[PDB]
Design a protein around this ligand. Sequence first.
Ligand code: CL
Length: 171
Amino acid sequence: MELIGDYSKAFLLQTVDGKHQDLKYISPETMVALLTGKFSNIVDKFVIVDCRYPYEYEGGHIKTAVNLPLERDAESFLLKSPIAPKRVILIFHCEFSSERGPRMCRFIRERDRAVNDYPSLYYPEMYILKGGYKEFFPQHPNFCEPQDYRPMNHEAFKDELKTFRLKTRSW
Ligand SMILES: [Cl-]
């Protein structure tokens, strides 16, 4: 297996197959291993980036996850004043196996490369949570807050979906 983005060392986490062959995917069990400190002697900090819309996040998210659905907010939070360390790891996800998480992962890498001298990176190790929140919640509900799940297509949130789509950079 290839080294992480700055070619400094191997990827730390065990990976699973996902839709995008160019990206690294992890299972809910691995996400729990991170949250429970199984990698605490090696990983200084990790950020779970929930790429879903605010109403989805508010209806139930993984504990400690940060809601960054807009590119400009993800860039501001992660790259204005980078989270320095040991390893720093980013995990991106959306509702299931859609494009919001993968697109944000690629965007952050593009911006990280742009602000550095090749091959140095602020975030060399990034993963996608396989199956997203839809698959994580039924496996580990106590690692979520609140203990619920609000789908993107929720019937009472059609206007909120529309309102938020109009805040994105491109459609
Ligand atoms: Cl955006």
